[PDB]
Amino acid sequence: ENEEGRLIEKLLGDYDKRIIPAKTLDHIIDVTLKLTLTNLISLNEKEEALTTNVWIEIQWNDYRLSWNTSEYEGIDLVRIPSELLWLPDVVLENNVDGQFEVAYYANVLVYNDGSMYWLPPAIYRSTCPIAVTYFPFDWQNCSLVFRSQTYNAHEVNLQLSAEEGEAVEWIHIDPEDFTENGEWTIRHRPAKKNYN
Amino acid sequence: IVCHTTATSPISAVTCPPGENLCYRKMWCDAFCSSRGKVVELGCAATCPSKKPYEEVTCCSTDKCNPHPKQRP
Amino acid sequence: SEHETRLVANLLENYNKVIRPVEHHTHFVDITVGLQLIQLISVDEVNQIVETNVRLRQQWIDVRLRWNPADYGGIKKIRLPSDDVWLPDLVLYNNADGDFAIVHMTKLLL
Amino acid sequence: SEHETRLVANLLENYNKVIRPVEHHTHFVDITVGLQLIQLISVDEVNQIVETNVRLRQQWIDVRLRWNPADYGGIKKIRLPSDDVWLPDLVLYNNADGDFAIVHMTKLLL
Amino acid sequence: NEEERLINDLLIVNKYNKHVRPVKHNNEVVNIALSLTLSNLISLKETDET
Amino acid sequence: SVMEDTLLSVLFETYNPKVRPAQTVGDKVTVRVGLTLTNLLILNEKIEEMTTNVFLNLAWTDYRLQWDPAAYEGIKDLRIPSSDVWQPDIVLMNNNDGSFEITLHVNVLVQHTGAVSWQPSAIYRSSCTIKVMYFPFDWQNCTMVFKSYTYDTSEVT
Numbered sequence A: 001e002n003e004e005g006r007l008i009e010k011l012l013g014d015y016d017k018r019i020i021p022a023k024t025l026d027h028i029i030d031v032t033l034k035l036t037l038t039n040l041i042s043l044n045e046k047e048e049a050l051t052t053n054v055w056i057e058i059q060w061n062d063y064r065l066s067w068n069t070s071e072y073e074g075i076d077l078v079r080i081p082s083e084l085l086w087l088p089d090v091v092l093e094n095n096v097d098g099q100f101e102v103a104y105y106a107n108v109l110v111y112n113d114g115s116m117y118w119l120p121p122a123i124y125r126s127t128c129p130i131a132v133t134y135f136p137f138d139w140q141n142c143s144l145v146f147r148s149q150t151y152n153a154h155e156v157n158l159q160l161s162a163e164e165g166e167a168v169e170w171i172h173i174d175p176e177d178f179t180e181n182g183e184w185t186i187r188h189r190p191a192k193k194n195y196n
Numbered sequence B: 001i002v003c004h005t006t007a008t009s010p011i012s013a014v015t016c017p018p019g020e021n022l023c024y025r026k027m028w029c030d031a032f033c034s035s036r037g038k039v040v041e042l043g044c045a046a047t048c049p050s051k052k053p054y055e056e057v058t059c060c061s062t063d064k065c066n067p068h069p070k071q072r073p
Numbered sequence C, D: 001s002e003h004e005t006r007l008v009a010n011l012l013e014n015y016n017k018v019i020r021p022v023e024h025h026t027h028f029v030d031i032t033v034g035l036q037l038i039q040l041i042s043v044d045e046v047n048q049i050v051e052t053n054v055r056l057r058q059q060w061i062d063v064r065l066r067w068n069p070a071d072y073g074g075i076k077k078i079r080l081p082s083d084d085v086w087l088p089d090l091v092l093y094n095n096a097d098g099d100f101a102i103v104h105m106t107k108l109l110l
Numbered sequence E: 001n002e003e004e005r006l007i008n009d010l011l012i013v014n015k016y017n018k019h020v021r022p023v024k025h026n027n028e029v030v031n032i033a034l035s036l037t038l039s040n041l042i043s044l045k046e047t048d049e050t
Numbered sequence F: 001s002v003m004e005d006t007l008l009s010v011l012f013e014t015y016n017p018k019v020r021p022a023q024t025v026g027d028k029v030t031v032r033v034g035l036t037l038t039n040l041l042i043l044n045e046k047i048e049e050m051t052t053n054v055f056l057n058l059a060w061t062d063y064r065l066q067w068d069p070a071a072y073e074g075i076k077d078l079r080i081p082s083s084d085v086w087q088p089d090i091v092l093m094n095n096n097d098g099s100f101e102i103t104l105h106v107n108v109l110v111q112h113t114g115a116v117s118w119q120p121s122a123i124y125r126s127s128c129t130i131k132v133m134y135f136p137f138d139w140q141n142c143t144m145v146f147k148s149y150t151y152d153t154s155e156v157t
């Protein structure tokens, strides 16, 4: 009799995934995302498209999925499929194809305080224009632009992750389990919040 | 010697065979650098393995120098 | 929010996404259409095909989707899914080899 | 079969597939994984990608899906669909451009 | 809206089944008239024969 | 047709399509597998692939889909969506893509005896080994293997 069922059926009962979890008016959902490059697959100079396999880590808080561990035998962490929850529609806008969304809709780790850790992997065909001038001795500045195509800034506040109180203003790359592409070498990998 | 080793599940305090009496501890954070923290490798060694720019090694000569950072020797 | 949950439950309770939003079948629903061009992806001069990335802005009123904010905590906007409400079937007549209508069921502002 | 119909109704009655198959949340699910390689389709040396046709054999126990054969006519095996029961989120980490998880349900054996 | 009442009296009230041919007796035929309008001829790739 | 609605309501009250029809525990279902070739499209030898447009011709007996036509205005045969009846997972195993199942889910033909005929269509991409010794003066075998993915001899014949 997994105590996680009692809990999940209590939470998802009286839960609408269409509804932003704003506790009240005036409340902006602080959505914290972080990118992890797994493979650089291609930069088709003809199509002018960069192909990447990334694990993007979305983090946010849903006040509706909070509970008291004492009532559930100490359970502080539950996995709920993302198809059942409200998610911020964080997408790749600078895509050439129409794949705005992620590839694998992984489960969302839900903590007792309402914290949500979603680590969905994605395969993105971005658009980055080429600078042919010095081809083939060229370096390209290819961007991945992430924004919510549903919610605005009065609703969600996109921000970068804060690990150890310092902002993660860069793409994370495992120095041991990262295979360099074969034609393209990564020199810089910054990340900044931009406003139009 | 009595070293802590990650070559078991769960972690164990096992004594090293003859030839290795240096308890080492490698650490480095991979793609899960945030949700989990740095990796933790522990065990036995005859000589302190090499170090790379991203690693964080600590080898000793005593018993149980290399506990998980969330424990004590 | 409890308010927005209650609101979205009471707005879609007796709502049929199959009927136009009109008080009488004779009247029309005016849809303000707008195209936002983002990038020109390709031009096949052989197949005579132009490939573009666009946003099809559409505005219209749904008389069945009204509410008083005073009774719902001051709410004046929500972000309903698009498969939940009536939508116009805007089709690209001069479509070549792609999709005629919209297939990305993005949320809408109400 | 009528026995198997009543059984498939009684198994999935109050069964939730979002919850791990464990009598207690402290226990673990032991999934015996196996890989059956069928053919090597391609080795892209440029993009460094290898296509393989594999069968990802997976075995585990769901104590919520146990029954007494004497009460169902001697049935000891059925072929439930995968989408109807809990499945482990096995994922190919070093996936380049394909699917990270399994996308073919392919009814399982119970 | 009159359409809301009608589309109910047709599909739900009268228990319309969409997996049944529109015939009073299962011995009549449903005549389907189909035409074809060519909007545009995109290709005749001779290599793929399509 | 009102008799068709009534008959369908009757048949599918307690009918579950996840369940293999065995009127008696231990029986096997007999599935007849034929193939109608409509076009051999391509036999690309660079990837060892074979593309065809075929109709599978499947036939089996479901003891649950029986009725007396005298009680239903002489209805001796029904056309029923394939998703509503039990069908065996007859698939192309030797595919080169990952498309085991058929493409077009035409509706089955059910007779009052329980005889279910399904003639679905598929653009199948099968793998065949190419013998590169006498190319282009070559002859290829290029089979198409068919079986139920999940049901075995103990279950279907």
Ligand SMILES: *[C@@H]1O[C@H](CO)[C@@H](O)[C@H](O)[C@H]1NC(C)=O
Binding pocket: A068, A069, A070, A071
């Ligand atoms: C959690 O539940 C227990 C009852 O098991 C109760 O005693 C305790 O006060 C609760 N904690 C909070 C923070 O409400």
